């Protein structure tokens, strides 16, 4: 069912946050993306049919050294 994937992208700056969100939002399967967390380097992705390995690779090539923090499913009502 519905994916929740959270990356940590350390050392991201505001322009790189914007770049990260654009990249994520343009990815097949993505419904939403937000930047959160104590350092503002959590990238919270929700969708369905997201190829998360292809996504982390693209973030690493274009943004910064992204790492997985969480993979889970949305708890539907």
């Amino acid at each position: 069912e519905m994916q929740k994937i959270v990356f940590k992208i350390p050392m991201v700056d505001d322009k790189s946050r914007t770049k990260a969100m654009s990249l994520v939002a343009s990815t097949v399967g993505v419904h939403s993306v937000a930047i959160a967390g104590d350092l503002r380097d959590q990238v919270v992705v929700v969708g369905d049919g997201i190829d998360s390995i292809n996504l982390v690779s693209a973030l690493r090539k274009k943004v910064g050294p992204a790492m997985f923090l969480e993979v889970s499913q949305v708890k539907e009502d």
Binding site: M2, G37, S72, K75
Partner: protein, 81 residues
Amino acid sequence: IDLSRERDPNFFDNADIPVPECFWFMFKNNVRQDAGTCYSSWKMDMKVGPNWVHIKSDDNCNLSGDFPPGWIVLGKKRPGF
């Protein structure tokens, strides 16, 4: 660890999906690493330092898992939930 003295996580509640009931806080020794939101009565896989941990939450946002030595992820029910 005294969660009463911890600042809230910096979260974004997504309007399209149910609101997660719990705050989580990750620590190594006494030191907060990051924090976020998660569902109660649920499960997630989270990277905790050098190890993935399968974390289960109960109805009261208590979090269970095989955490690596020195690490913990602690849950709290959000206010109003």
